[PDB]
Amino acid sequence: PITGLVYDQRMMLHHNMWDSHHPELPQRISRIFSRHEELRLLSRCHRIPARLATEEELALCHSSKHISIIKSSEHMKPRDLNRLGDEYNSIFISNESYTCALLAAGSCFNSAQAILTGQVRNAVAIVRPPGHHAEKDTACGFCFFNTAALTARYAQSITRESLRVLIVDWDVHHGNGTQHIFEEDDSVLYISLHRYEDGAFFPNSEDANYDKVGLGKGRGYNVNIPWNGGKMGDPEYMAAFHHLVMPIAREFAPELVLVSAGFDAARGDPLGGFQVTPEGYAHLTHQLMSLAAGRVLIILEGGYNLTSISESMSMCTSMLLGDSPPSLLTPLKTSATVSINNVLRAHAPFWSSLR
Numbered sequence: 001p002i003t004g005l006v007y008d009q010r011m012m013l014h015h016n017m018w019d020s021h022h023p024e025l026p027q028r029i030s031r032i033f034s035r036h037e038e039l040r041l042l043s044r045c046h047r048i049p050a051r052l053a054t055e056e057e058l059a060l061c062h063s064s065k066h067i068s069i070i071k072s073s074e075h076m077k078p079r080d081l082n083r084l085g086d087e088y089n090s091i092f093i094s095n096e097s098y099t100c101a102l103l104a105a106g107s108c109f110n111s112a113q114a115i116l117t118g119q120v121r122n123a124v125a126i127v128r129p130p131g132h133h134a135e136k137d138t139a140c141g142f143c144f145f146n147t148a149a150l151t152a153r154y155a156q157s158i159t160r161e162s163l164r165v166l167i168v169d170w171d172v173h174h175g176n177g178t179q180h181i182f183e184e185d186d187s188v189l190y191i192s193l194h195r196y197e198d199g200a201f202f203p204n205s206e207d208a209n210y211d212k213v214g215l216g217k218g219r220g221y222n223v224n225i226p227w228n229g230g231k232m233g234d235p236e237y238m239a240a241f242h243h244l245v246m247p248i249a250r251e252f253a254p255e256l257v258l259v260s261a262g263f264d265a266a267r268g269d270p271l272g273g274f275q276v277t278p279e280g281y282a283h284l285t286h287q288l289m290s291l292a293a294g295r296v297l298i299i300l301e302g303g304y305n306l307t308s309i310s311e312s313m314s315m316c317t318s319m320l321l322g323d324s325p326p327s328l329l330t331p332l333k334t335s336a337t338v339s340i341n342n343v344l345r346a347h348a349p350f351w352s353s354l355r
């Protein structure tokens, strides 16, 4: 009954040489790590070492061309890093970016391995750059390789191809890359909650709407919960978990749970504009711990208020360690009820628990 933690300060070396105030800051991960020490959570965790992902491991989800392009940035002069970054939607690149992205993925693989070999029950991965916008063939939205997607495939690569993996993505943005990588797959259930605003919110695609339910044998295995109409918080996230995330997850019966845990829906985040509290994230984590015999891996995605993400992810680790959930029914925003019911309508053909 042990919680693993992976963190490596070498992931701070990825930086924006043109705008040192860009919100995807190196100190995102060092501030989260420091808060774990201050709250005396670090000493209660089993430290899992970081490692580099291998290029063969990246090929679990990414094309050889994409891997080769990002790898080539290691040796580029600034002008060519600028040019290469500009080929993507919202990407900046330094000579250290490729290595940091490898460490983020390799750290999560070692964490999934620690869970699946029984060395730990659950784990937290304090990693950057993020992953969930990265596609098979392209970088996007501060993400180079899709760490969470890769970790699901790595888990399957050391157990069985059909291992049931649930990915819960509570980053405020839609994980477009994760959805696409698994869109035809019934072994990986992708559930995303995200601000949508009818396509006005990044990444600005109708791929994120509730009617995108998966393709082929994956039909029913992609669950988009899109928010419209401004600020959402704990009441709306708790209701989405009550009506949708947890009933569907229980029916799926995952053997491993991965959380794409962005904290940019948090109170105070300048990019997300939402109001989920640290206690809220604690309750979300505690609910997910009831799944998969507690085999849960929390993977940092976005989140840009340093104080907010440090307190919120620490509360998640406190729940993984078995601490009692903090005290937290406020009526939902009217448009949140509309969103939840749209998703229920979309997925009742596939999940009996919704009927």
Ligand SMILES: O=C(NO)c1ccc(CN(CCO)C(=O)Cc2ccccc2)cc1
Residues within 6 Å of the ligand: 023, 090, 130, 133, 141, 142, 171, 173, 202, 262, 264, 271, 301, 302, 303
């Ligand atoms: O991964 C993410 N969050 O977890 C993420 C990815 C891409 C963006 C892009 N984005 C929104 C649309 O341009 C922005 O960067 C907005 C911005 C932020 C600071 C100053 C000026 C503008 C914003 C956030």
Ligand SMILES: [K+]
Residues within 6 Å of the ligand: 169, 170, 171, 172, 173, 174, 175, 192, 193, 194
């Ligand atoms: K999301």
Ligand SMILES: [K+]
Residues within 6 Å of the ligand: 183, 212, 213, 214, 215, 222
């Ligand atoms: K779809």
Ligand SMILES: [K+]
Residues within 6 Å of the ligand: 182, 183, 184, 185, 186, 188, 189, 190, 214, 218, 221, 222
């Ligand atoms: K899927």
Ligand SMILES: [Zn+2]
Residues within 6 Å of the ligand: 171, 172, 173, 262, 264, 301, 302, 303
């Ligand atoms: Zn985000």
